[PDB]
Scaffold this active site. Structure first.
Site, PDB file in Angstrom:
ATOM      1  CG  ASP A  51      -1.841   1.167   1.316  1.00 22.86           C
ATOM      2  OD1 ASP A  51      -1.923   1.938   0.335  1.00 22.86           O
ATOM      3  OD2 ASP A  51      -2.508   1.316   2.362  1.00 22.86           O
ATOM      4  CB  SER A  69      -1.825  14.231 -13.548  1.00 27.96           C
ATOM      5  OG  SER A  69      -2.178  13.968 -14.897  1.00 27.96           O
TER       6      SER A  69
HETATM    7  N1  LIG Z   1     -11.466   9.207   8.677  1.00 21.60           N
HETATM    8  C1  LIG Z   1     -10.364   9.074   7.800  1.00 21.60           C
HETATM    9  C2  LIG Z   1     -10.344   9.748   6.566  1.00 21.60           C
HETATM   10  C3  LIG Z   1      -9.280   9.612   5.732  1.00 21.60           C
HETATM   11  C4  LIG Z   1      -8.202   8.804   6.098  1.00 21.60           C
HETATM   12  C5  LIG Z   1      -7.005   8.653   5.176  1.00 21.60           C
HETATM   13  C6  LIG Z   1      -6.857   7.208   4.654  1.00 21.60           C
HETATM   14  O1  LIG Z   1      -7.801   6.446   4.562  1.00 21.60           O
HETATM   15  N2  LIG Z   1      -5.546   6.745   4.233  1.00 21.60           N
HETATM   16  C7  LIG Z   1      -4.407   7.585   4.330  1.00 21.60           C
HETATM   17  C8  LIG Z   1      -3.611   7.201   5.614  1.00 21.60           C
HETATM   18  C9  LIG Z   1      -2.255   7.173   5.577  1.00 21.60           C
HETATM   19  C10 LIG Z   1      -1.517   6.834   6.741  1.00 21.60           C
HETATM   20  C11 LIG Z   1      -2.197   6.512   7.918  1.00 21.60           C
HETATM   21  N3  LIG Z   1      -1.429   6.151   9.130  1.00 21.60           N
HETATM   22  C12 LIG Z   1      -3.578   6.529   7.956  1.00 21.60           C
HETATM   23  C13 LIG Z   1      -4.304   6.865   6.812  1.00 21.60           C
HETATM   24  C14 LIG Z   1      -5.395   5.358   3.742  1.00 21.60           C
HETATM   25  C15 LIG Z   1      -4.968   5.300   2.244  1.00 21.60           C
HETATM   26  C16 LIG Z   1      -4.208   4.012   2.045  1.00 21.60           C
HETATM   27  N4  LIG Z   1      -4.263   3.498   0.699  1.00 21.60           N
HETATM   28  C17 LIG Z   1      -5.319   2.546   0.488  1.00 21.60           C
HETATM   29  C18 LIG Z   1      -6.688   2.905   0.935  1.00 21.60           C
HETATM   30  C19 LIG Z   1      -7.072   4.245   1.469  1.00 21.60           C
HETATM   31  C20 LIG Z   1      -8.414   4.395   2.044  1.00 21.60           C
HETATM   32  O2  LIG Z   1      -9.211   5.135   1.119  1.00 21.60           O
HETATM   33  C21 LIG Z   1     -10.558   5.321   1.400  1.00 21.60           C
HETATM   34  O3  LIG Z   1     -10.961   5.103   2.504  1.00 21.60           O
HETATM   35  C22 LIG Z   1     -11.363   6.166   0.438  1.00 21.60           C
HETATM   36  C23 LIG Z   1     -12.625   6.602   0.809  1.00 21.60           C
HETATM   37  C24 LIG Z   1     -13.376   7.377  -0.067  1.00 21.60           C
HETATM   38  C25 LIG Z   1     -12.838   7.714  -1.335  1.00 21.60           C
HETATM   39 BR1  LIG Z   1     -13.928   8.811  -2.535  1.00 21.60          BR
HETATM   40  C26 LIG Z   1     -11.576   7.277  -1.708  1.00 21.60           C
HETATM   41  C27 LIG Z   1     -10.816   6.498  -0.823  1.00 21.60           C
HETATM   42  C28 LIG Z   1      -6.165   5.425   1.350  1.00 21.60           C
HETATM   43  C29 LIG Z   1      -8.220   8.141   7.326  1.00 21.60           C
HETATM   44  C30 LIG Z   1      -9.291   8.275   8.162  1.00 21.60           C
HETATM   45  N1  LIG Z   2     -15.713   3.688  -1.116  1.00 20.86           N
HETATM   46  C1  LIG Z   2     -14.356   3.327  -0.946  1.00 20.86           C
HETATM   47  C2  LIG Z   2     -14.007   2.339  -0.015  1.00 20.86           C
HETATM   48  C3  LIG Z   2     -12.708   1.996   0.148  1.00 20.86           C
HETATM   49  C4  LIG Z   2     -11.721   2.629  -0.606  1.00 20.86           C
HETATM   50  C5  LIG Z   2     -10.267   2.249  -0.430  1.00 20.86           C
HETATM   51  C6  LIG Z   2      -9.999   0.977  -1.243  1.00 20.86           C
HETATM   52  O1  LIG Z   2      -9.801   1.061  -2.439  1.00 20.86           O
HETATM   53  N2  LIG Z   2      -9.983  -0.325  -0.576  1.00 20.86           N
HETATM   54  C7  LIG Z   2     -10.211  -0.461   0.828  1.00 20.86           C
HETATM   55  C8  LIG Z   2      -8.926  -0.168   1.674  1.00 20.86           C
HETATM   56  C9  LIG Z   2      -9.031   0.461   2.874  1.00 20.86           C
HETATM   57  C10 LIG Z   2      -7.861   0.718   3.633  1.00 20.86           C
HETATM   58  C11 LIG Z   2      -6.605   0.324   3.149  1.00 20.86           C
HETATM   59  N3  LIG Z   2      -5.379   0.600   3.933  1.00 20.86           N
HETATM   60  C12 LIG Z   2      -6.500  -0.313   1.930  1.00 20.86           C
HETATM   61  C13 LIG Z   2      -7.652  -0.568   1.184  1.00 20.86           C
HETATM   62  C14 LIG Z   2      -9.713  -1.532  -1.387  1.00 20.86           C
HETATM   63  C15 LIG Z   2     -11.037  -2.316  -1.629  1.00 20.86           C
HETATM   64  C16 LIG Z   2     -11.957  -1.495  -2.499  1.00 20.86           C
HETATM   65  N4  LIG Z   2     -13.269  -2.072  -2.681  1.00 20.86           N
HETATM   66  C17 LIG Z   2     -13.265  -3.268  -3.470  1.00 20.86           C
HETATM   67  C18 LIG Z   2     -13.064  -4.485  -2.650  1.00 20.86           C
HETATM   68  C19 LIG Z   2     -11.748  -4.679  -1.976  1.00 20.86           C
HETATM   69  C20 LIG Z   2     -11.374  -6.011  -1.470  1.00 20.86           C
HETATM   70  O2  LIG Z   2     -12.258  -6.983  -2.033  1.00 20.86           O
HETATM   71  C21 LIG Z   2     -10.693  -3.657  -2.196  1.00 20.86           C
HETATM   72  C22 LIG Z   2     -12.069   3.609  -1.536  1.00 20.86           C
HETATM   73  C23 LIG Z   2     -13.376   3.957  -1.697  1.00 20.86           C
END
Ligand SMILES: Nc1ccc(CC(=O)N(Cc2ccc(N)cc2)C[C@H]2C[NH2+]CC=C(COC(=O)c3ccc(Br)cc3)C2)cc1
Ligand SMILES: Nc1ccc(CC(=O)N(Cc2ccc(N)cc2)C[C@H]2C[NH2+]CC=C(CO)C2)cc1
Ligand SMILES: O=C(O)c1ccc(Br)cc1
Ligand SMILES: [Cl-]
Length: 330
Positions: free
Chosen positions: A35, A199
């Site tokens: 990640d 970008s």
């Molecule tokens: N209340 C809240 C809000 C935002 C955050 C950032 C957060 O969620 N982070 C940054 C972060 C980095 C380091 C650390 N110690 C913690 C978090 C995780 C990222 C990690 N990459 C994968 C997955 C991710 C999760 O994306 C989604 O939830 C998501 C939701 C809606 C949409 Br539209 C697009 C994506 C992104 C965390 C909590």
């Molecule tokens: N509304 C929405 C929900 C989630 C996100 C993040 C995101 O992309 N994921 C969650 C996540 C959360 C935290 C971390 N640290 C890594 C991945 C991956 C999952 C996304 N949904 C598809 C099904 C999955 C598995 O079967 C993959 C983006 C938009």
């Protein structure tokens, strides 16, 4: 040194990618979600609440002769989708594709939220964003990449994600056979702890390229491509029957559609995402409405170049003194 590991989609939609990681002595192999948008290496473990484990492979530190409890250290993370996990911390030996780090902080989960429990294929996360985002308290810990960097032949890792197919994470070298043309490098801001870049614009299908700055993060842990509402509206306007659904939570489109490509700019270069990469299948089992792979970032505060974008490219995460990002077609 170098390492090279195959990364494999967890399902037929490329919802996420898992990469095998060896932890401890003797090795315990767990399949982790690499990640680049977070900075903790955390795993399902023998300490995880039993009811919150459903099929995952667990790390059992008591069975590792090299595991050492990091006294007083705990971790807790919450994510934007409402998911979370927390626990304690061991140091142990961790190897990825032949590259070994001793003394890596391995964050053992005591609790995980339902979305993690429900994903039986993912045994934990390996964070590859900057160590400034690591959650271990009271003493912050380094990522696997930061720990390995000095030993690497070159201070880089590369992501080469496949579409409906396995791909590769490499550490310490650029495989010049893995891409076409040249790699275009672009500036990174590390101010927020992410691989954040700008970008230079976009095109929809065969349409004219729109030059416009789009700040976002390169995030292998996010499945989809999240972009400004104006950009996303322009994309879906080219798909007959597509609409933004409030009940579903984003743009949906008829499963019978053939989707246009989407191009994004990297400096003067262009990466083309084929239309098929943007199809995430039926919104519910048996539905003829499909979920789109390009969605609005409007409610996020940042744009996210997730797997939908990254898998169209060979991506270099350059961790030199001044980090940069490289993109090539492939
Ligand atoms: N209340 C809240 C809000 C935002 C955050 C950032 C957060 O969620 N982070 C940054 C972060 C980095 C380091 C650390 N110690 C913690 C978090 C995780 C990222 C990690 N990459 C994968 C997955 C991710 C999760 O994306 C989604 O939830 C998501 C939701 C809606 C949409 Br539209 C697009 C994506 C992104 C965390 C909590
Ligand atoms: N509304 C929405 C929900 C989630 C996100 C993040 C995101 O992309 N994921 C969650 C996540 C959360 C935290 C971390 N640290 C890594 C991945 C991956 C999952 C996304 N949904 C598809 C099904 C999955 C598995 O079967 C993959 C983006 C938009
Ligand atoms: O839901 C959010 O607010 C959010 C999600 C991911 C990232 Br990165 C930043 C913010
Ligand atoms: Cl339906």
């Amino acid at each position: 040194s170098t390492g090279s590991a195959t990364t494999t989609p967890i399902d037929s939609l490329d919802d996420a990618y898992i990469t095998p990681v060896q932890i401890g002595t003797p090795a315990q192999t767990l399949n982790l979600d690499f990640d680049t948008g977070s900075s903790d290496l955390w795993v399902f473990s023998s300490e995880t609440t039993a009811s919150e484990v459903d099929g995952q492979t667990i790390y059992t530190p008591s069975k590792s002769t090299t595991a050492k409890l990091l006294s007083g250290a705990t971790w807790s993370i919450s994510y934007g989708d409402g998911s979370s996990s927390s626990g304690d911390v061991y140091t142990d030996t961790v190897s990825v594709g032949g590259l070994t780090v001793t003394g890596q902080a391995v964050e053992s989960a005591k609790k995980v939220s339902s979305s993690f429990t429900e994903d039986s294929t993912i045994d934990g996360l390996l964070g590859l964003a900057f160590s400034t985002l690591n959650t271990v308290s009271p003493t912050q810990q380094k990522t696997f990449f930061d720990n390995a960097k000095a030993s690497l032949d070159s201070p880089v890792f590369t992501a080469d994600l496949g579409y409906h197919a396995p791909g590769t994470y490499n550490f310490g070298f650029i495989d010049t056979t893995a891409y076409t043309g040249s790699i275009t490098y672009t500036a990174v801001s590390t101010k927020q702890g992410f691989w954040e870049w700008t970008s230079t614009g976009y095109a929809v299908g065969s349409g004219t390229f729109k030059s416009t700055s789009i700040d976002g993060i390169a995030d292998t842990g996010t499945t989809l491509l999240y972009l400004p509402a104006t950009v996303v509206s322009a994309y879906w306007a080219q798909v007959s029957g597509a609409k933004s659904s409030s009940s579903v939570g984003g743009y949906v489109f008829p499963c019978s559609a053939t989707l246009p490509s989407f191009t994004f700019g990297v400096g003067s270069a262009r990466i083309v995402i084929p239309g098929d990469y943007i199809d995430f299948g039926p919104i519910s089992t048996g539905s003829s409405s499909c979920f789109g792979g390009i969605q609005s970032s409007a409610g996020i505060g940042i744009n996210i170049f997730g797997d939908v974008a990254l898998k169209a490219a060979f991506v270099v995460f350059n961790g030199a003194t001044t980090p940069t990002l490289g993109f090539a077609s492939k």
